[PDB]
From Swiss-Prot:
UniProt binding sites for Mg(2+) 2: 74, 78
Protein's recorded name: Pentalenene synthase
SS bond partners: 122-130
Keywords: Antibiotic biosynthesis, Disulfide bond, Lyase, Magnesium, Metal-binding
InterPro entries: Isoprenoid_synthase_dom_sf, PentlnSyn, Terpene_cyclase-like_2
Cofactor mode of binding and number, as noted: Binds 3 Mg(2+) ions per subunit.
Subunit-structure text: Monomer.
Catalytic activity, reaction form: (2E,6E)-farnesyl diphosphate = pentalenene + diphosphate
Residues binding Mg(2+) 3, per UniProt: 205, 209, 213
Residues reported to bind Mg(2+) 1: 74, 78
Gene (UniProt): penA
CDD domains: Terpene_cyclase_nonplant_C1
Length: 284
């Protein structure tokens, strides 16, 4: 676990953590005190603040919500629904709809909640951005549907969408009220970096929830696996850095001006780094 990236936390996790229950209460994602507790025990506000150490107040609150939503939403597939691609999809589209236009009050609340997050997240960003981010969310959703075919390379290509790392990183951008020059986002390097960002969270998570999952995964596919599992992350991070260093050249290659280059650096540190690192701290 060589993550040469400094741990960070928004100096606002305070409030953020304390007021996290408000949003979900109103949107109706939490209908019971017991539920409230089960949520608080998740430490999602915490998480959000590790991913977005650079955001405070309102901004930070949105990240808390994304994190809260992520888990409330995931639970909806822990029963009979996560075994029927037709049933999950039925829900999937009711939420995904939000991306396109307004949702009928008839929509389930998990959908409404998402709608709210997506409104706030995308507003204030270049049109190109929302679209690109929506692109991601759809991929997120379809992932759950593919994932619903429960009824290495085999695994990653799929877990890479359900894992939800991208929508999270995108949020970093929104939360930090800035956008990486679009042309750089689609570079081979930035991609490989982002790919790594996913795999690592992907891998870590599968080692954290190993117990519960085998009690009913990446490790499976024992003492040997987890070993090189760690190795993999090590090498991945190693390369991540190797890549980071390439950024300057990249910035040249795409003729970035100052502002852009700045943006890039914020993306690098406040969006990518944090998503890889944040996961770790929290996971412990």
């Amino acid at each position: 676990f060589h993550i040469p990236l400094p741990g960070r936390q928004s100096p606002d996790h305070a409030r953020a953590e304390a007021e996290q229950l408000a949003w979900p209460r109103s949107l109706g994602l939490i209908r019971s005190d017991a539920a409230a507790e089960r949520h608080l025990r998740g430490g999602y506000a915490d998480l959000a603040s590790r991913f977005y150490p650079h955001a405070t107040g309102a901004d930070l609150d949105l990240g808390v919500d994304l994190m809260s939503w992520f888990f409330l939403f995931d639970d909806l597939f822990d029963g009979p629904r996560g075994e029927n691609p037709e049933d999950t999809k039925q829900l999937t589209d009711q939420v995904a709809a939000a991306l396109d236009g307004p949702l009928p009050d008839t929509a389930p609340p998990i959908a409404h909640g998402f709608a709210d997050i997506w409104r706030r997240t995308c507003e204030g960003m270049t049109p190109a951005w929302c679209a690109r981010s929506a692109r991601h969310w759809r991929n997120y959703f379809d992932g759950y549907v593919d994932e619903a075919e429960s009824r290495a390379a085999q695994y990653l290509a799929m877990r890479r969408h359900t894992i939800g790392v991208q929508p999270t990183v995108d949020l970093a951008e929104r939360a930090g009220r800035f956008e990486v020059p679009h042309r750089v986002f689609d570079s081979a390097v930035m991609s490989a970096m982002l790919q790594i960002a996913v795999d690592v969270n992907l891998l870590l998570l599968d080692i954290a929830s190993l117990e519960k999952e085998e009690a009913r995964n990446m490790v499976m596919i024992k003492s040997r696996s987890v070993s090189h599992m760690q190795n993999e992350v090590r090498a991945r991070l190693e390369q991540y850095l190797l890549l980071e260093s390439c950024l300057p050249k990249v910035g040249e290659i795409y003729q970035l001006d100052t502002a852009e280059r700045e943006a890039l650096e914020r993306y690098r540190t406040d969006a990518v780094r944090t998503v890889i690192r944040g996961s770790y701290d929290w996971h412990r």
